């Protein structure tokens, strides 16, 4: 049977007791969800190929398992390997034993290695605990380093390979140098224990960790796709998210409905088929109009007895648009075919037509003693041997050179007088090699001039129309499609680009020859994973694919058999962004979630159709419907009816904004030179960039100092919270700092500075050139500033950003905040206890979230991670050789002598220089946007907290009443009050009432009606009072408007 290696394939490529930070490694890694071959019974275990990687894991009830034997032939013929367990000590033998079909010491031979260590462990992990044991092994050969891993992983589900995780660290090794291909299992069998076999791959893990130096995370690349969030996405505990995976991307889609069906013509045939060509002397010279041959059909034709090409391989057929082609036709001698080469040596090669010392695309020849040679012998051609003007290349000397000097004894007139260069050539159809007339031309090309768009006269989006071979062996290394094109033409031949080097194809007068580039098959990979945590079901998106075309590298299937990797699913769908191999496309249209594209999302509930349905969509698949924000909540036409609120609701959020880097300067020289005479002198010689960069870095340093200061010096002088915390019935209980607890952060803030993932990319971390100068305001100084913040916010008024803090209550502070938002302070003087209950209870439950909601603060953590990646990609770029023999400095200083050392170190520096300048420019972009963030943080604090701004969707949604600041390591949290009326109940009104012939309108109120009477109330609070002349005004007379009615005023 075939069982996935769900979490099997992850291990330690080398010595790393890492902790909780993100790093990648590139070695021979077993694919995830890799199907494993079972061998439980004979029905013992057939021999298998090594495949440059194999996996094993034992699931035994009791101690049975013996060792194995490794080698090419597993026989005395070839150097082999042995693995034996003595239950006392393990040994490894590289020995050559006679191959026994069934095992253990058949014949000891050539035992070059010996080793003793503790035996590889076994049972009572299988029996004593009443569970059993899963003993994973990792077998690898890289540079002969026999990479042996193991541990125990007890499980109780022996049905198949279950979930659950364990690390993998090395055991022993040998410096073999063996070429390992095949292997056997030894044990001293219809029903033997169950195990696995998983074939590995040379891949690139990223490794994340716990705090105890143990593995926790890695992913797959072009297999599992579930646990292929990538081969690098840093976590088993991924969330529901679209994760681009690998560069074997896609094949095409459908398109809009225009269609070519137009072919044109042009008489090129004479250029090669004019059965009466010119003599080799008078090499005929034609260039022709828009008409070509499918030089693939010229390549694969046996009509040409000589298909010789100087410069272009004949397998580069489609993208050939060549600017100028000069056709030069001429007869040949039977033995001159080899002599056809640019810059050759001989009589004719430079004395009848010379191709110069440069490439000549293709020169095409074939014997034609049938169409030319006659029974009397074709009799009409010549050859000029060595008695002429030496023939500069591309010269048709049609001159009759009777003499060269007319007097010299060499040729002249003395001695030889009747000599003449025009020596004629003859032959016969049946003569043999040496004088066989091959039909020979010259095809010389030009370059560097072809701006156009009509190297595409083309159309017909398709799936594909022809066999798998050579659709488009261009878009170099090639792939594509072929079909027919549709346009008219003009005298140019052979060249154009669609736009600016988008070379497409060479058009037909007869053939098919289409690209508009027929695909490089396309770009897109968008594997869906909902997370290993709450799911184990997978699907894959293929952006911009015809789903009938088996998207990835059409039915590549050169990999392990996997329903997703081996694309054959009928559970598919076609979006705008291509096929959805693991889909169950539905039209339910819930809220959007993990997105696919153009309006396709996922993540339904666990009982959509079946009990087997899970929280992840459509167990064993993934359903991706059409996106919607939901449905309508239409609002209607009120002429004067007032759906007036009598109650209201509030909620509280989290607002998260970084306010600095992890303050970092970079001594540019020390970063680069590392206090080295070589680089110190070398950079003193080289430019002044580093000085400017260090200036910029000091600027950003004092910048985050200024950001911290501005976010935490909005008030000139500090205000401690009140001693007794009994604010007009409004409990807070969580945001005031600790009165005497260590670090004096708020209870919320204690829980934050601790709940922040105290690794926080682990970044307690200066290595080289680095530094972390700590900020101006110490963490406790930020805390004290938050104290000032709450002191002003709930203790002084609208005014602690307005200078000195006052000594004023919050009962009446909230009274004046009601008073100044447009609804009188009747609200709390009625309901101070009730609004206090709502407000403080909500604020309390919000901290329950901020305690449970890890990663909901993903922006400060995100920026910590971006600086982490900044320094990390920085150091890995420091680990970029960039033109030397290695990325190290000192070795290649000493490995090579003075000139080589200095030039290689020059390259090393210049490259790492450029990398640092790119880092600092990206860091300055980040620093400008995070300056914007710091100004925005100070601005939220100021506007929303220090007073109360009118800003909308800046601190909450809508009714802005006040606001609250918080703190963090390098960012800040924020929460601010959001007020919303509710309970709409309809009530009639009117812009005017007729009474005593005058028009009556209110000052602050509206003429509300309850069905038969009319009152004046406010428009977020329905308070019934009689309409009189003390709270209203009367003026003029009833104007022209809809709604004049009775019920006069008092």
């Amino acid at each position, epitope marked *: 049977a075939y069982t996935n290696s769900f979490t099997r394939g992850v291990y330690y490529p080398d010595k790393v007791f890492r902790s909780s930070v993100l790093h990648s490694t590139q070695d021979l890694f077993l694919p995830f969800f890799s199907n494993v071959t079972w061998f439980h019974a004979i029905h013992d275990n057939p021999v298998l190929p090594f495949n440059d990687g194999v996996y094993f894991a034992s699931t035994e009830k009791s101690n049975i398992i013996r060792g194995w034997i490794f080698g090419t032939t597993l026989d005395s013929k070839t150097q082999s390997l042995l693995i034996v367990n003595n239950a006392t000590n393990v040994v490894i033998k590289v020995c050559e034993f006679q191959f026994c079909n069934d095992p253990v010491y058949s014949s000891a031979n050539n035992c070059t290695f010996e080793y003793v260590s503790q035996p590889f462990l076994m049972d009572l992990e299988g029996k004593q605990g009443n569970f059993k044991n899963l003993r994973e092994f990792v077998f690898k050969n890289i540079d002969g380093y026999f990479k042996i891993y193991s541990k125990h992983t007890p499980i109780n589900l022996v049905r198949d390979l279950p979930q659950g995780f364990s690390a993998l660290e090395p055991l022993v090794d040998l410096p073999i140098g063996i070429n390992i291909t095949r292997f056997q299992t030894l044990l001293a069998t219809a029903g033997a224990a169950a195990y696995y076999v998983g074939y590995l791959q040379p891949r690139t893990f990223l490794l994340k960790y716990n705090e105890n130096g143990t593995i926790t995370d890695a992913v797959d690349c072009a297999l599992d796709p579930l646990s292929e969030t990538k081969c690098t996405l840093k976590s088993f505990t991924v969330e529901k998210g679209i994760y681009q995976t690998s560069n074997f991307r896609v094949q095409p889609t459908e398109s809009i409905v225009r269609f070519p069906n137009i072919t044109n013509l042009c008489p090129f045939g004479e250029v090669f088929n004019a059965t009466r060509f010119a*003599s080799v002397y008078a090499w005929n010279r034609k260039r022709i109009s828009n008409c070509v041959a499918d030089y693939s059909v010229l390549y694969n034709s046996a009509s040409f007895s000589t298909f010789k090409c100087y410069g272009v391989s004949p397998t580069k057929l489609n993208d050939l648009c060549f600017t100028n082609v000069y056709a030069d036709s001429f007869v040949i001698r039977g033995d001159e075919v080899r002599q056809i080469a640019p810059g050759q040596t001989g009589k004719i090669a430079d004395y009848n037509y010379k191709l110069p010392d440069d490439f000549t695309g293709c020169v095409i020849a074939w014997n034609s003693n049938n169409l030319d040679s006659k029974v009397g012998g074709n009799y009409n051609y010549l050859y000029r041997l060595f008695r002429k003007s030496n023939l500069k290349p591309f010269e048709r000397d049609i001159s*009759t050179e009777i003499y060269q000097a007319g007097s010299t004894p060499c040729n002249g007139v003395e001695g030889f007088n009747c000599y003449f260069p025009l020596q004629s050539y*003859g032959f016969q159809p049946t003569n043999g090699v040496g004088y066989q007339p091959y039909r020979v031309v010259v095809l010389s090309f030009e370059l560097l001039h072809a701006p156009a768009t009509v190297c595409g006269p083309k159309k017909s989006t398709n799936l594909v129309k022809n066999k798998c071979v050579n659709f488009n062996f261009n878009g170099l290394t090639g792939t594509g499609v072929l079909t027919e094109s549709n346009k008219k033409f003009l005298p140019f031949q052979q060249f154009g680009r669609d736009i600016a080097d988008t070379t497409d194809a060479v058009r037909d007068p007869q053939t098919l020859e289409i690209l508009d580039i027929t695909p490089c098959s396309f770009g897109g990979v968008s594997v869906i994973t909902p997370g290993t945590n709450t799911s184990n079901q997978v699907a894959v998106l293929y952006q911009d694919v015809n789903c009938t075309e088996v998207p990835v590298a059409i039915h590549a299937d050169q990999l392990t058999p996997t329903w997703r990797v081996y694309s054959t699913g009928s559970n598919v769908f076609q979006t705008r962004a291509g096929c959805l191999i693991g889909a169950e496309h539905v039209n339910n249209s819930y809220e959007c979630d993990i997105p696919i594209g153009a309006g396709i999302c996922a993540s339904y509930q666990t009982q959509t159709n079946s009990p087997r349905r899970a929280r992840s969509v459509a167990s064993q698949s993934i359903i991706a419907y059409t996106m919607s924000l939901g449905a309508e909540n239409s609002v209607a036409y009120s002429n004067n009816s007032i759906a007036i609120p009598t109650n209201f609701t509030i909620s509280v959020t989290t607002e998260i904004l970084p306010v600095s880097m992890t303050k970092t300067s970079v001594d540019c020289t020390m970063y680069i030179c590392g206090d080295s005479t070589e680089c110190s002198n070398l950079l003193l010689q080289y430019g002044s960039f580093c000085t400017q960069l260090n200036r910029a870095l000091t600027g950003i340093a004092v910048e985050q100092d200024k950001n911290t200061q501005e976010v935490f010096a909005q008030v000139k002088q500090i205000y401690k919270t009140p001693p007794i915390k009994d604010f007009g019935g409004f409990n807070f209980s969580q945001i005031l700092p600790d009165p005497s607890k260590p670090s004096k952060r708020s209870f919320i803030e204690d829980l934050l500075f601790n709940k922040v993932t105290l690794a926080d990319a682990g970044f307690i971390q200066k290595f080289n050139g680095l530094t972390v100068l700590p900020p101006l305001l110490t963490d406790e100084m930020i805390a004290q500033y938050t104290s000032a913040l709450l002191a002003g916010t709930i203790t002084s008024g609208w005014t602690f950003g307005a200078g000195a803090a006052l000594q004023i209550p919050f009962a009446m502070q909230m009274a004046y905040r009601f008073n100044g938002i447009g609804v009188t302070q009747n609200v709390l003087y009625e309901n101070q206890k009730l609004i206090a209950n709502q407000f403080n209870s909500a604020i309390g439950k919000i901290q329950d979230s901020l305690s449970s909601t890890a990663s909901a603060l993903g922006k400060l953590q995100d920026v910590v991670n971006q600086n982490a990646q900044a320094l990390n990609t920085l150091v890995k770029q420091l680990s970029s050789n960039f033109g030397a023999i290695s990325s190290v400095l000192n070795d290649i200083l000493s490995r090579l002598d003075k000139v080589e050392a200095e030039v290689q170190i020059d390259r090393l520096i210049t490259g790492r220089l450029q990398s640092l300048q790119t880092y600092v420019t990206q860091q300055l972009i980040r620093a400008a946007e995070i300056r914007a963030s710091a100004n925005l943080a100070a601005t939220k604090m100021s506007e929303c907290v220090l007073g109360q701004s009118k800003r909308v969707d800046f601190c909450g949604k809508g009714y802005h009443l006040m606001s609250f600041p918080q703190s963090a390591p390098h960012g800040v949290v924020f929460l601010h009050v959001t007020y919303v009326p509710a309970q709409e109940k309809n009530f009639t009104t009117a812009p005017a009432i007729c009474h005593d012939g005058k028009a009556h309108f209110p000052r602050e109120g509206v003429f509300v009606s309850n069905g038969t009477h009319w009152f004046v109330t406010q428009r977020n609070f329905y308070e019934p009072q009689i309409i009189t002349t003390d709270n209203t005004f009367v003026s003029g007379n009833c104007d022209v408007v809809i709604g004049i009615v009775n019920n006069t005023v008092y």
Partner: nanobody
Amino acid sequence: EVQLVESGGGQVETGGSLRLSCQASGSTFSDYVMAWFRQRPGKEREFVATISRNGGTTTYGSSVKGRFTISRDNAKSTVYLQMNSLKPEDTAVYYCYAVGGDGDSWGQGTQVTVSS
């Protein structure tokens, strides 16, 4: 329309003379160099004579050369080869060979017979 139609050739008894004409009917004749060629039955073809482009130089054969007489006429655009001084060694079909433009130029091939 530059297709060379050869003419003038025909039966000639030994000791006579013949005028030879050849036309690229509807296109140029003048500055194409003329070079006739004799092909003997049972033997190999042999160089006879030719002309220059300018017309001023009637560059005849290597041996005794005054036998053959050549000229160009613009007014009718064909050769005027006044053959003379026969030997029985000229019974052959000849080639117009207007080497200008396309060198080995032909398309009919006119035959002159040097009869007895």
